[PDB]
């Protein structure tokens, strides 16, 4: 009938998340360019989301196909449901521990005791938080996990409480922190970017000024604006090999400022002491900070459009899940179950959306997937 087009639509969704997600795990592992804590999470997230594709998602087709009668042994219906919420709790935990992590960095300035396993240590808490949450599925699992001979999370309380714990507080939390980070990190840009205007403009005046005292009043602020940038160079956590080069860059290019301040003592060589238009060093810190701003504005676009698609697709299922129990007396739960049947597969296809966002908006992801698709290393 009409269902003949949508019959296998689930299988497209099982095929995309079991594969296209899988490459994301491959790509982050194989290519050294994508070795970042915020692209580390995505790999872990991708496992949660992939694991859901090859474990939970197959049985939902078997059950949808059987008429929703439970086909398997009754003792294993409290397990398929367990993985499903675990992974789905794990999946949103990864997404919300990407904004709690990335909001943290703009609030708190900085030494890294643990280095590049700041993520792997974080990640384990993301998973072990979600395994903690899902202990109750098998704790009471073996009853209240069957309704009219279908495998269905029928515990009224877990349905209600566990919709917030694994959806509305994680997703609320991330929405809040995603937008505070954007506004905050939009602001840092303007503050840092307006310094190089000050540095260049104030250096224009020193260049074309014939009063020694004018240069003194003019070049005084060059130290200030350079320092403000120095304080404000972005976290992007803070790696051990890159921040020293900025320290040397800031310090080494501060010498030009500081030295030219003396030559205060006195204008013959003041004009030419601050000629950091001759020095290679000064030119790099523009490029290699101004790139670093644009590599955070791109990541925020992807994360916004990954957060948003994940919230907007799981939200139907959870809103009517609660409705199944918050409107127990008045709703028609042949209809709510019908609606619930289909809002999980709206939601189950947020597990495929991630890799497509990456290829669409990350040139590094795009190139590797085809190379993995074509089997090139
Ligand atoms: C059975 C319980 C633990 C529920 C979770 C399922 C299992 C399979 C979980 C437990 C801990 C998880 C791992 C924790 C550590 C890492 C390293 C990290 O950089 C990426 C994900 C990865 C590789 C996870 C993969 C999935 C994983 C092994
Ligand atoms: C996409 C998102 C916003 C979906 C929101 C779904 C929630 C708010 C709504 C949408 C569909 C709704 C159900 C639609 C139809 C019925 C049948 C009726 O006899 C009882 C109410 C009941 C069961 C509604 C309960 C509330 C409900 C579950
Ligand atoms: C149609 C019947 N099925 C299929 C197993 C469900 O109701 C599953 C149970 C859900 C569920 C209940 C209660 C709390 C929760 N947290 C996270 C989920 C969750 C995920 C959610 N999965 C997607 C489907
Ligand atoms: C659903 C069809 C699967 C097609 C796979 C496409 C690319 C082929 C890659 C291998 C699939 C399984 C990967 C397991 C080893 C991953 C390698 C690694 O990440 O270190
Ligand atoms: C920007 C958007 C980039 C994502 C590319 C498209 C990804 C798939 C989007 C959603 C489709 C799934 C919705 C219902 C699935 C039906 C089964």
UniProtKB/Swiss-Prot annotation:
Principal location: membrane
GO terms (BP aspect): artery smooth muscle contraction; behavioral response to cocaine; chemical synaptic transmission; detection of mechanical stimulus involved in sensory perception of pain; detection of temperature stimulus involved in sensory perception of pain; G protein-coupled receptor signaling pathway, coupled to cyclic nucleotide second messenger; G protein-coupled serotonin receptor signaling pathway; glycolytic process
Activity-regulation annotation: G-protein coupled receptor activity is regulated by lipids: oleamide increases HTR2A-mediated activity. Inhibited by IHCH-7179 small molecule: IHCH-7179 acts both as an agonist activator for HTR1A and as an antagonist inhibitor for HTR2A.
Localization, UniProt: Cell membrane; Cell projection, Dendrite; Cell projection, Axon; Cytoplasmic vesicle
Motif DRY motif, residue numbers: 101-103
GO MF entries: 1-(4-iodo-2,5-dimethoxyphenyl)propan-2-amine binding; G protein-coupled serotonin receptor activity; Gq/11-coupled serotonin receptor activity; identical protein binding; neurotransmitter receptor activity; protein tyrosine kinase activator activity; protein-containing complex binding; serotonin binding
Domain of life per record: Eukaryota
Motif (NPxxY motif): 354-358
Keyword Glycoprotein: yes
Positions of transmembrane segments: 10-26, 41-66, 76-100, 119-142, 157-182, 301-326, 335-360
Subunit structure: Interacts (via C-terminus) with MPDZ and PATJ. May interact (via C-terminus) with MPP3, PRDX6, DLG4, DLG1, CASK, APBA1 and MAGI2. Interacts with GRM2 and DRD2; this may affect signaling.
Purpose: G-protein coupled receptor for 5-hydroxytryptamine (serotonin). Also functions as a receptor for various drugs and psychoactive substances, including mescaline, psilocybin, 1-(2,5-dimethoxy-4-iodophenyl)-2-aminopropane (DOI) and lysergic acid diethylamide (LSD). Ligand binding causes a conformation change that triggers signaling via guanine nucleotide-binding proteins (G proteins) and modulates the activity of downstream effectors.
Comment field on protein domains: The PDZ domain-binding motif is involved in the interaction with PATJ, CASK, APBA1, DLG1 and DLG4.
UniProt name for this protein: 5-hydroxytryptamine receptor 2A
Organism: Homo sapiens (Human)
Name of the gene this protein is made from: HTR2A
